[PDB]
């Protein structure tokens, strides 16, 4: 129990932090990855002067603060502001003292060696956690779907990745990163919806375009004869009621937004798209392992939640793969937390105890120890 209860799992994202206790089924804490700094001197009624704001209080009060994102494209870019988000996570969100809890953290696919050593330096030397561990994100997603070999298409708020994993070892030279994700996708909907003849003028109009994207957006299979369908004008249309009455209608654009993930050309991106990239990762891997990867395309991440994403991907890679092959696109329902759940499982596991980096290992080996 000492640490059975006690292991923490913190998944640091570009848009959201997911956090909680190893053992739980889902994150106890989910909140924006921002750190707000007040543009002016003054106070809220009853509070003192605050130097900084994190998560939702930074979002809610955004009009008087300069908002900053510590993690650009999955990589920690500002370490002063990240130690601020961690502090908030332990002390306010989970309300635990960190110096008696083992902490499993996550990093990104080709996270620079030096960063994995730096967050270890900050975990052990400024938070004084007993022990910690850094798992790679795609690797926890795979594992949370039971398996050990597969290829994960991972897509969240600032990055998309393909991480081919074989008997647990993520394959460095076959990993692909596509910098277009849910953030890019909300801003494109924004324009095709103002372009539908609308105005997201106040900040209460801006924010909810993102809630339109999440609730009403679709990834149609045969996106071709779906536009064609749009035109005959079926009961395909969908009206959402705004903060007030102002019933906005979205028929068609509803799927023009996730067609951006297959066609980056919709947004002036010259890069290849999700399905081709799944494939290219795969023809960059060893030959003998390619049947395995093809029958185990695990999807994880908030942006892979658009319904019919899996069917489109299913047919997208069947038709690029040699017919002798078995294609299989696994997309679980909890996928917006796969990464986290994979960490919860792993860290609560009976056999993981012997991989925890302890302060004994650290004080004796330097940050190098956990770096592997």
């Amino acid at each position: 129990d000492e640490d059975e209860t006690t292991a923490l799992v913190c998944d640091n994202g570009s848009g959201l932090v997911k956090a909680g206790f190893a053992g739980d089924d889902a994150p106890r804490a989910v909140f924006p990855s921002i750190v707000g700094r007040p543009r002016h001197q003054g106070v809220m009624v009853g509070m003192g002067q605050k130097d900084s704001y994190v998560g939702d209080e930074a979002q809610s009060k955004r009009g008087i603060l300069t908002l900053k994102y510590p993690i650009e494209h999955g990589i920690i870019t500002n370490w002063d502001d990240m130690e601020k988000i961690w502090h908030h996570t332990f002390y306010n969100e989970l309300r635990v003292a960190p110096e008696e809890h083992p902490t499993l953290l996550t990093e990104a696919p080709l996270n620079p060696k030096a960063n994995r050593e730096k967050m270890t330096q900050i975990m052990f030397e400024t938070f004084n956690v007993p022990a910690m561990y850094v798992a790679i994100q795609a690797v926890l997603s795979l594992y949370a779907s039971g398996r050990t070999t597969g290829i994960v298409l991972d897509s969240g708020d600032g990055v998309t990745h393909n991480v081919p994993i074989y008997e647990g070892y993520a394959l460095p030279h076959a990993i692909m990163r596509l910098d277009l994700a849910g953030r890019d996708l909300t801003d494109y909907l924004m324009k095709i919806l103002t372009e539908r003849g609308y105005s997201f003028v106040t900040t209460a109009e801006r924010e909810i375009v993102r809630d339109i994207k999440e609730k009403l957006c679709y990834v149609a299979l045969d996106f071709e004869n779906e536009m064609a369908t749009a035109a005959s004008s079926s009961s395909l249309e969908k009206s959402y009621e705004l903060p007030d009455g102002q019933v906005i209608t979205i028929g068609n654009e509803r799927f023009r937004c996730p067609e951006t993930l297959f066609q980056p050309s919709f947004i002036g991106m010259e890069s290849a798209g999700i399905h081709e990239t799944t494939y290219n990762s795969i023809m960059k891997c060893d030959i003998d392992i390619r049947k395995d990867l093809y029958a185990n395309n695990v999807m994880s991440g908030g942006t892979t939640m658009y319904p019919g994403i899996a069917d489109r991907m299913q047919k997208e890679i069947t038709a690029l793969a040699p017919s002798t092959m078995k294609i299989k696109i696994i997309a679980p329902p909890e996928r917006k937390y796969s990464v986290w759940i994979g960490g919860s499982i792993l860290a609560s596991l009976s056999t993981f105890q012997q991989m925890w980096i302890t302060k004994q290992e650290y004080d004796e080996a330097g940050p190098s120890i956990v770096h592997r």
Partner: protein
Amino acid sequence: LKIAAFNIRTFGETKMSNATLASYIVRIVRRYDIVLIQEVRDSHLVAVGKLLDYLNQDDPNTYHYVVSEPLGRNSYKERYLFLFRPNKVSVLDTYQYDDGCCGNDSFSREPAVVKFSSHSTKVKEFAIVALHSAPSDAVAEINSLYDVYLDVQQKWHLNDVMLMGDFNADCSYVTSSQWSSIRLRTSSTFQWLIPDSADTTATSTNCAYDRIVVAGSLLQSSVVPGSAAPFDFQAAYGLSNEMALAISDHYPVEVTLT
């Protein structure tokens, strides 16, 4: 020290986005060393944000703020914003009156209460209680401010308190016979500065909806005689009837301490 209370109708992102409107709000606001702005319907605080960028574009500290969280049983809400010149006064402390929120809560929008410290006046410390009353409820709420005055005295041991805001204190909302049921009126502890005479509406109506009330012997000795009055920005700034009302349907009520 020029103090004022100003209900800007629906001060919001939109209102701050007109340049012409924004320029007149900024110009009014700069006449005062302490200003209270009511009907601040700003969710993310973007609009308060814009207003301070304008006041502080050349010294970062021409103005500092105090702002409530959004307020309303109604649940269509607004905040209380104080903006003060930090070189003139300091904020020693602050709290949101505890009105009982249930069904009991005495106010629509619980007064924010801010204790100031001033060194160029005879009063050196004094609290300002802020209120925009529900018009429908005006008689009970101007009377329940008697109890918020009593709380400032329990908590801060302070007599010199100023109570101000849009009290909806005249015409249909409070009549001659109702006054007799407002302790804030009957207790001779409080000197009411904007008389029942005063028109403080920018529209055609004539009502002294907007008040400044002072208790405290030293605060009352600091009010410069006859500086308490509304500010006719339409008449002062030559605005049309169309323009003036586009700012607000109300006028600032000001007072000067010494």
